[model samples]
Target: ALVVTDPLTRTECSACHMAYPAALLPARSWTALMADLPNHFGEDASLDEASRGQIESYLVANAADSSGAGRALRGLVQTDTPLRISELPWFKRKHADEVSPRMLEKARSMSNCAACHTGAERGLF
Candidate 1:
């Protein structure tokens, strides 16, 4: 069965506005998220002390190792999967000649996943 977040209800915050399935990334990725909290996307997305503790607890409790989807993502990330989120392999193959200087500029960061990946929220295509 697939694990998904509830449909988003509020737009008060970017992170909260869109619900992200915790299974999207591996445990390492989640750990990275918490470790790089305040500097998220070059902004101080620091949670309140209590909120941070709560989120951390929740993440640890339902971590990738404990979830089927998370386990699959971890396997993909670790194996020779065709998709490359952190590098250029997948993009190179898909947009070989179409990539332009302007596109290259935006492609330098992982934050632009939504540009070519229309359904990134649901995980790999």
Candidate 2:
């Protein structure tokens, strides 16, 4: 349900990690992330102006605040620009009480959703 059809977004963002559904975060978050591509979570993920503009536009258009997935932003501070999906209050609360140790081990990191959810690439998670 959270799938995005933008191929460039999928390819570029997933070069090092999964292409997180745009609905996972709010528009401001996506804007913040795009503004700092050179420091993208500690690595340089800078893109050319045209590609960056397109991806940013797509992500913002499908953001949680607009895609009927505002649940992910529940209890979040409106002023906060959360960049990490794993760090969302809703996400942490959901996982803290349920994610099994074995599952965590299998994934090695909470960020690696595909390790546990086979359909993660399709936004089935």
Candidate 3:
């Protein structure tokens, strides 16, 4: 999952949350999320027009369906394009035996990969 990503996407998106790889989601999901950045997770995460376009393009071009991520998600994705990485069936299955509910309760949310995954920056998990 260590696909290429724009420097700008990491600079902007990771300012608050971890800069997630676009391959974790589908193109449509990225598009929808970018469109509503003003209220991203209940806060204003909007960017300038130029920056927005660049990041969006970077994401869509390397998204799940268009990149290597699809192979892993094909069986997990059921109907709709998943907006949340934690909601993916494969995501759950991967963590089910590794992490229990009580362990995840104290740390950050499931999307906060860096919390438990020390090698997250290199996409080892």
Candidate 4:
């Protein structure tokens, strides 16, 4: 698990979805994501410019590329810019045989890390 310490990043991002640890994705992915907050996963997550700027900086600085996220980025190609953590080859391989259909049913979606990782929100997954 990874921790995010920026207050704005935590507050604004988790207002809708988990303030996923910035180390989950590369800098480009975070840049792309912040560029399109208005259509975030089909929701209008548009933010004020100041808020967006600070949050983007925080995410980019702590991204997998800058954070030495060797395991989190394992199997990922240099050209890839995956927006979803679940889309990463490493993540897929990690959950492939471990996740049961019953767990999927309970989680409703793989993005619900908290469903299986008891301390996911606390960066203890």
Candidate 5:
């Protein structure tokens, strides 16, 4: 029900982009996003004051503890839940060594979801 847009542009510069449903992370994570600036993806991609306010407002309004989209994403991030997203064998296998600081910086710059995931946008492993 909460349709959020991708804030950053990818290589293709497509306007219509996918969102990682807010529920995927805890409220703490969202708060972290709002608080952290310039260090986002190891880059100073800080959002403008108004844009930051808007995004924070939207995220808080539709936080995982409230909206269905948040609930679904929460389910994915929960380790105890049967439906795990990141814990999937393939995801674990692939991401095991891919989260290093260097790799993270590169991935952020490249926007190469496929570097760690085969078909990330399609939601395929």
Candidate 6:
């Protein structure tokens, strides 16, 4: 994702799950998602409209096509398509060859990025 980072976005998003790189998904994805925080992941991640705007803005601004590592998303998905980073083709290509189901289970699945990429929270991944 973009080298620029925001503390609020980092703190808030990571409170529930790993604070994924904004480049993981495109601007449209963040926009669509911010439109509905109440039903997020079948749980309440409702935030005030103000904070939502701030977070959404940061995400969209640094989205895949806009960031350097953004190229990491090439051929993975379209800007308008919505998919988690763990679901990206690159992630699959990198891990599918050797990671076993048991290892993934122990690591709490790919979605649990913090389990392996410890620096993920600090945007070091």
Find the candidate with the highest TM-score and give its number: 4
lDDT by residue (1-125, candidate 3, tens digit) is: 65345799989988876888888788888999999999888789999999999999999998887745575475654467777878877777788899877779855688788888888877877
Model 2 spans > 4 angstroms off? 67-69
lDDT of 4 by residue, 7-88 (tens): 9888888886677998888999999999999998889998999999999999888888885755878998889999899899
Model 5, 1-125: lDDT tens digits are 33344353221122223344444445555667667766754556466777776666665555665545443343244443322224434345656765788877766733355565556555553
For candidate 2, lDDT tens digit of each residue in 1-125?
A: 76767999999999988889988899999999999999987799999999999999999998999856577898698788888999999899878978889989889989898887899998787
Runs with alpha carbons beyond 4 Å of true place in candidate 6? 1-4, 67-69, 77-80
lDDT of 1 by residue, 1-125 (tens): 22333332111124632333444445555556766667865667676666665555554455545556543443254544222234324334555676677876875644455555567555543
Query: Which 10 residues in a row give candidate 3 its minimum summed lDDT?
Result: 69-78
TM-score order of candidates, top first: 4, 2, 3, 6, 1, 5
- TM-score (C-alpha, index-matched) for candidate 6: 0.83
What would the TM-scores of all predictions be? 0.47, 0.92, 0.88, 0.94, 0.46, 0.83
Output the lDDT of residue 120, model 1.
53
Residue 65, candidate 3: how far off, in angstroms?
Answer: 0.5
Residue 51 displacement in candidate 1 (angstroms): 2.1
User: Clashing residue pairs in candidate 4, if any?
Assistant: none
**Each candidate: what lDDT?**
0.48, 0.89, 0.81, 0.88, 0.50, 0.73
User: Could you give me the TM-score of model 1 versus the true structure?
Assistant: 0.47
Q: What is the lDDT of residue 77 in candidate 4?
A: 82
- The segments of candidate 4 whose C-alpha lies over 4 angstroms from its true place after superposition are none
As for TM-score, the candidate ahead, 2 or 4, is: 4
- The residue pairs in collision within model 1 are none
Report the poorest 10 consecutive residues by lDDT, candidate 4: 63-72
Q: Tell me which of candidates 3 and 4 scores higher on TM-score.
A: 4
Worst-scoring 10-residue span by lDDT in model 6: 74-83
